[PDB]
Amino acid sequence: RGSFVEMVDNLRGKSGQGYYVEMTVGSPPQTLNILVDTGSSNFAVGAAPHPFLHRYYQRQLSSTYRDLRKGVYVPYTQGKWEGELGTDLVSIPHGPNVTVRANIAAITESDKFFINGSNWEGILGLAYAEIARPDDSLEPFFDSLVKQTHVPNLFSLQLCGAGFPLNQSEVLASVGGSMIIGGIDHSLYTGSLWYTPIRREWYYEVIIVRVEINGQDLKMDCKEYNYDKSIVDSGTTNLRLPKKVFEAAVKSIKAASSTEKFPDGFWLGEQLVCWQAGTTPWNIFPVISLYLMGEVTNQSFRITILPQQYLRPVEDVATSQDDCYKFAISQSSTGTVMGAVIMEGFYVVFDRARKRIGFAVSACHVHDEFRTAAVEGPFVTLDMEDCGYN
Ligand SMILES: NC1=N[C@@H]2CC[C@H](NC(=O)c3cccc(Cl)c3)C[C@@H]2CS1
């Protein structure tokens, strides 16, 4: 019955623009909004004016700033930045009551990284040292936090999708979810928490052992589901699937929803589809179940998501009264990515101390009168470690 009221509701944002938490850096404290990112391992903040930044880190104004006299260059598939490494004192106001000295990449140049109107000015990489830039000697924030305090080595995330689009006033005003640092808040989920092992501590890597679309088995060699890895990543919008899986899944989703036909651009994730107010035909779209390796030998469990999760609400071009959505599943050449739109269905427990990730149905997940998201088990499943790619 852990309650963490200082932390409940400490997030804002939306799957399309990222979820962020308020943080302070430096002495006296400089307030910044920071993207919560389980798919990376650098704490990096805007440190120089940029047209899309409303504020930034001013190292010269901080008496506790330490310069590491080393640059870092961080290119992504889309976008990139460069920065200067340093350390400073850092707190999370709606977090545990602690201040820690942590590595900070002070971003001085960037290209297609900051997003007009995102409302965040930096990123908090919550994954492990192995994928930190420049190399694995740069201790990640969470590692400093646990080393320097008594905060238990665990965090949990409830990302709350509205189920409808939010204009910028609403998105600033609305509670977007909870990051619970050092614990599990029982009010953020229903049902049981089920756990999957962290396969290796770099990304939050997991193993998927079966996929179903409306109960029907996708029936691929399970290695395909994890080629070349499967990760849980709050800093990616979509559910991303390896090319072959993506194709198979889209074929199956088209077939189940085939009473209605959509543009190729919809399935490519590029164009919106709109229905008359209140008439979105949720029931024609299938549920998607991912089975994950369990903690017990030969046992798995499954998480089930709705189209309310994988159809991302977007504002109309004509700005009409229609309910509009983009298809939030896309192909990946870097393995499966369980992005923000999947995490919106679940309360996700990143149990680093026990090297496992928990899932439970989210208390804030969007659904309808007839179906809800689910986390169910156990299932007898054999040869699961063979699903892992090498
Ligand atoms: N996990 C990853 N992290 C890095 C840094 C965050 C960035 N994400 C965003 O800007 C962003 C933009 C809009 C929505 C969301 Cl959820 C995130 C991606 C890259 C590559 S993948």
For residues 21 and 7, the answer to whether their CB atoms sit within 8 Å is no
Whose alpha carbon is nearest atom 1 of ligand 1?
39
Based on the number of CB atoms within 10 Å of its own CB, is 277 exposed (0-12), middle (13-18) or buried (19 or more)?
exposed
Nearest CA to ligand 1 atom 12: 17
Spatial distance between the Cα atoms of 367 and 282, rounded to a whole number of angstroms: 9
Contact 193, 349 (CB under 8 A): yes
Nearest protein Cα to ligand 1, atom 5: 235
- The backbone torsions φ and ψ at residue 48, rounded to the nearest 5 degrees and listed phi first, read -155, 150
Q: What are phi and psi of 188, to 5 degrees?
A: -95, -5
Whole-angstrom CA distances from 189 to 346, 354, 360 are: 8, 20, 6
Q: Ligand 1 centroid vs 79 CA: distance in angstroms?
A: 10
* Among the listed residues 266, 252, 231, the one whose alpha carbon sits nearest the alpha carbon of residue 125: 231
- Rg of the chain over Cα atoms, rounded to whole angstroms, equals 21
**Determination technique for this entry:** X-ray
State the distance from the centre of ligand 1 to the C-alpha of 16, rounded, in angstroms: 10
Q: Which of 20, 37, 121 to mutate to test the pocket of ligand 1 (most atoms within 8 A of CB)?
A: 37
Q: How far apart are CA 26 and CA 140, in angstroms?
A: 17
User: Is 264 a catalytic site residue?
Assistant: no
Q: Rounded to an integer, what distance in angstroms lies between the CA atom of residue 19 and that of residue 13?
A: 4
Say which amino acid occupies 1.
R
Cα–Cα dist 44/340, whole Å:
20
Determine whether 233 is an active site residue.
yes
Strands 80-91 and 66-75: antiparallel
The candidate with the shortest Cα–Cα distance to 123, out of 110, 261, 268, is 110
One-letter amino acid identity for 67?
Answer: D
Distance CA 138, CA 42 (A): 8
- Order of strands, sheet of 311-314, starting from the edge strand that comes earlier in the sequence: 273-275, 323-327, 311-314
Taking the centre of ligand 1 as the mean of its atom positions, its distance from the CA of residue 365, in whole angstroms, is 22
Please give the Cα distance from 72 to 334 (Å, whole number).
23
Catalytic residue from among 37, 143, 185, 323? 37
88, 143, 185, 233: the active-site residue: 233
Closest CA to 359 of 371, 369, 345, 372: 345
Give the 3-state secondary structure of 79-128: CEEEEEEEEEEEECCCCCCCCEEEEEEEEEEEECCCCCCCCCCEEEECCC
Name the phi and psi angles at 235, rounded to 5. Answer: -95, 10
Residue ranges lining ligand 1, Cβ < 6 Å: 17-18, 37, 39-40, 76, 115, 123, 233, 235-237, 340
HEC per residue, the chain:
CCCCCCCCCCEEEECCCEEEEEEEECCCCEEEEEEEECCCCCEEEECCCCCCCCCCCCHHHCCCCEEEEEEEEEECCCCEEEEEEEEEEEECCCCCCCCEEEEEEEEEEEECCCCCCCCCCEEEECCCHHHCCCCCCCCCHHHHHHHHCCCCCCEEEEECCCCCCCCHHHHHHCCCEEEEECCCCHHHEEEEEEEEECCCECCEEECEEEEEECCEECCCCHHHHHCCCEEECCCCCCEEEEHHHHHHHHHHHHHHCCCCCCCHHHHCCCCCEEECCCCCCHHHCCCEEEEEECCCCCEEEEEEECHHHHEEEECCCCCCCCEEEEECEEEECCCEEECHHHHCCEEEEEECCCCEEEEEEECCCCCCCCCCCEEEEEEECCCHHHHCCC
Report phi then psi at 264, rounded to 5: -50, -35
* Contact status, residue 27 vs residue 193, Cβ threshold 8 Å: no
Instruction: Count CB atoms within 10 A of the CB of residue 88.
Output: 24
**What is the set of domains in the chain, with CATH numbers?**
19-151 (2.40.70.10), 152-390 (2.40.70.10)
- State this model's resolution in angstroms: 1.9
Q: Could you tell me which of 157, 86, 74, 79 has the C-alpha nearest to residue 114?
A: 79
For residue 330, the CA-to-ligand 1 centroid distance in Å is 15
